[PDB]
């Protein structure tokens, strides 16, 4: 499996840093799709090279989707292409993961109506504006979407997440 | 006139220090609520006073309300009688200025629905998912509720507001 | 009108940002000179673009003159292009503004000897030793002279400075 | 499984929270031990929650050791009873991980000479001196003693310290 | 001799730890002075502990007095006993070293005018208007008093300054 | 004499610019060498300009050697270049000063077996396992090797170097 994760500066630094390693676990390919090549650095100071633009992303040759929080997503869902990038693979049905503020991206992609999931808690009326049966709950799965709200919840996410990718 | 302020931790600086004193030149009483007594600080690290707590504010005694931004409006807006000023305030037509991610409380309101406005682009979608025709301007009056959406916008923004108080 | 500000990195940030919107609000143009052009940074992080250098600058193509504090007040006064500039408009009469520490940029053109004013306490003996009566006061008017102690004066400061260009 | 995690102020954010969430994955009960009940807070400025101190630690109560690097492994090696517990542990055939600077804690408990692993490069002098037969390798597995590097070998570190709790 | 420094918050960390250090070596006992009891932290970070206040000092007692820069000083020189303290000591040819920011002081106690010495340039003309033959010179000594200018100088300062408590 | 710094980033900043100070008072030359030219910045952050790199350093026009402390050692002690020139002065007897993490560099040079010294008491133990006997000491002599453990011991440190380089 190829998991693509969709980030920028101001990143969330352990829900970047813990999915990535957790699924190279598994020994799925990982790959960073920021703006621009180089490095983006995370709230927190850690950095990370990024390995593909949005623009040379092509969502046909990637089977799953991370969306890490932080303040990242309010700038990448500002970029029709990782928008673009995030609707095909949602709607396509491939495993979608998300936490904190990275559903954001998934509300400006419009592909939330109708679905269940989580957030962080201070985003939770954005979520249900977009359409989203929000609950509080440590981890969610609704299909191909698997949602949480905090650092906390890391545990629970990709256990969940590596479940959808078996 | 007595202009409110609902903040929090992490208010962006100059999004309250600008209106709080501009208003004070006209003479106006200004009064900063938060959760609790004492000082918050802004994101730059200035600190204010707090003058009262969301608790103890009774909306009949206030003429006007303005949210800055930062990342206190996402905390600011899942505090239910915050909420309730704000909803209340705007719904009764009084003045309500707000920057950045200030109108996140807005949109908790429910007060957004057939509303004109802007706000930080980053949250362009929100707005619209309330129901707000987002408009990409230094600043927006519609009819009581003056919006504008970065520190760049500052003088518009009061140049706008001033203009709704006496 | 024309408002110019001197000024350079370590300004105090609320004493460039507030009179810069604020003049632009009344439709003054205004412009920041510093050291080169670029940006700046304040002490609390804020950047703001550079207009011109000192070098470029006509002090006859200029209405009033604005001097916020900070660290950059002792760097500014050792530039003798800078120095000339606050010299020549204090001199010809133009409306001044200053806050904080913004004054050493005054003391440092030798004209402050029989004026009245105040600045930041921590330098009133220097001011008093430049030939200020100084006072002790938010705001000070001495005929085109304006000045303020501190970031709390700010909404007095520019109330009496924005009656000097009318 | 109880897992024991013997860290303090200055760990590397990631090197604790990493395997604190991965192993929670697997069902495992994970306790934070270090000088004072509170919290503590690592070189990135995350903070965590300490379980209890190294004074009320029973080595006997608890199954496997985890030693996260940052700057705490040296004021937690100055530690007789924090020494004590890893000494215990590490003899008894317990399944211990290290990376980074962690392995300083294992050099002071004195259990390293003859033993196989890996460690910060900074301090490959160190782990050499202390008798250990040291490899520049993502983890490396010499019966209970699970170590890697840096943060870019979580992945391959906790692949392995898992298969070690089974 | 026993030395006395004469600081608070904000001072130049070496321009403290520096002579504070030098003049130990000597055999000379070093006492720092400030407002209250406790610790008292530098520009850059670094913790000193506070031997006692302004108040408790008796200028009689002690044979020296040192003066670091930074941002204290121009707080220091607000305190009515702890101009006095300098004051006394200066106008009685105890010896006196003061660094950067450290003549504000002696500014405020009235003791400079026919005087030569430097300082941080950017003060040069405070220094001057209240009546200093100003130098530009990593070190000057006139009679009871050493003065340089800045942290670069530090090796000259002391250099002069031990040869006076000698 | 000549007296070289091997240092690099995150020196701890008073452990370097307090010696180059002390010697330069002598009538010393001073040199700061380092991976690159350009400057590198203290844990506190003071910048220092860097004279010469690791490579271009010949030993033999170097008298005496001054390791400071901080994260530096841990990055310099793994340069080949760096760790021969401390190997070589230190093997021809000539005088070397360390602080803290400073040893470092002498035990990745292998000269420190059956010698005596102190250093950060958090390395004990390494000291120890490259064949030094610790001693916990504000300074130690042996022969030509002057070691101190903490900032706090500066003033006896560089009191005892000073007689070895007259």
Redesign the interface.
């Given at each position: 499996m190829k998991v693509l994760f969709l980030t920028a500066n101001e990143f969330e630094?352990?829900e970047l840093?813990?999915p990535?390693?957790?699924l190279?676990?598994e020994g799925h390919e990982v790959y960073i799709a920021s703006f621009e090549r180089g490095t983006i650095t995370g709230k927190?100071?850690?950095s990370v090279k990024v390995d593909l633009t949005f623009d040379k992303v092509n969502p046909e040759e990637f089977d799953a989707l991370v969306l890490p929080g932080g303040r990242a997503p309010?700038?990448v869902?500002?970029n029709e292409k990782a928008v673009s990038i995030a609707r095909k693979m949602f709607s396509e049905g491939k495993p979608v993961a998300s936490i904190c503020h990275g559903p954001?991206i998934l509300?400006?992609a419009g592909v939330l109506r109708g679905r269940k999931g989580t957030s962080?808690?201070?985003?939770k009326?954005?979520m249900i504006?977009?359409g989203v049966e929000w609950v509080d709950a440590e981890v969610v799965v609704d299909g191909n979407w698997v949602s949480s709200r905090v650092?906390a919840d890391?545990?629970?996410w990709?256990?969940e997440f590596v479940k959808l990718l078996k």
């Open positions: 630094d352990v840093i813990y990535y390693h957790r190279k676990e927190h100071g850690y309010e700038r869902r500002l954001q509300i400006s962080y808690p201070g985003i009326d954005d504006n977009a650092p890391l545990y629970a990709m256990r």
